[PDB]
Amino acid sequence: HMCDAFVGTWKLVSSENFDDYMKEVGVGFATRKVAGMAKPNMIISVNGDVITIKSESTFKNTEISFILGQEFDEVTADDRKVKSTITLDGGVLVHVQKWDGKSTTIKRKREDDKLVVECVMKGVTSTRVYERA
Ligand SMILES: CCCCCC[C@]1(C(=O)O)CC(=O)Nc2ccc(Br)cc21
DSSP-assigned beta bridge partners for residue 99: 102
Taking the CA of residue 31 as reference, the ligand 1 atom at the shortest distance is 1
Using alpha carbons only, give the angle 88, 8, 86 rounded to the nearest 5 degrees. Answer: 25
The 3-state secondary structure of 3-64, one letter per residue: CHHHCEEEEEEEEECHHHHHHHHCCCHHHHHHHHHCCCEEEEEEECCEEEEEEECCCCEEEE
Ligand 1 neighbour 35 (Cβ under 6 A): yes
Q: CB under 8 Å to 25, separation ≥6 — which residues?
A: 78, 80, 102, 104, 121
Backbone angles phi, psi at 23, to 5 degrees: -60, -45
77 lines ligand 1 (CB under 6 A): yes
Q: Which of 29, 56, 80, 119 to mutate to test the pocket of ligand 1 (most atoms within 8 A of CB)?
A: 119
Q: Which atom of ligand 1 lies at the shortest distance from residue 42's CA?
A: 10
Furthest CA-CA distance within the chain: 41
SS3 101: coil
129 is in an annotated binding site: yes
First-last CA distance in the chain? 21
Q: Which helix H or strand E contains 24, and what residues bound it?
A: helix 18-25
Backbone angles phi, psi at 104, to 5 degrees: -140, 150
Q: Which atom of ligand 1 is nearest to the CA of 95?
A: 13
CB neighbour burial string for 17-29, b if at least 16 within 10 angstroms, e if fewer:
ebeebbebbebee
Give the C-alpha separation, 73 to 57, whole Å: 21
* 128 assigned to a ligand binding site: yes
CB 8 within 8 A of CB 44: yes
Buried-state track 40-78, b at ≥16 Cβ within 10 A, e below 16? bbbbbeeeeeebebbbebebbebebebeeeeeeebebbe
Give me the domains of the chain, ranges plus CATH numbers: 4-132 (2.40.128.20)
Spell out the long-range contacts of 24-32 with Cβ–Cβ below 8 A and sequence spacing 24 or more.
24/121, 24/122, 24/124, 25/78, 25/80, 25/102, 25/104, 25/121, 26/80, 26/102, 27/78, 31/78, 31/79
In the beta sheet, which residues pair with residue 114? 111, 131
Supply the DSSP symbol for 68.
T
121, 24 contact by CB (below 8 A): yes
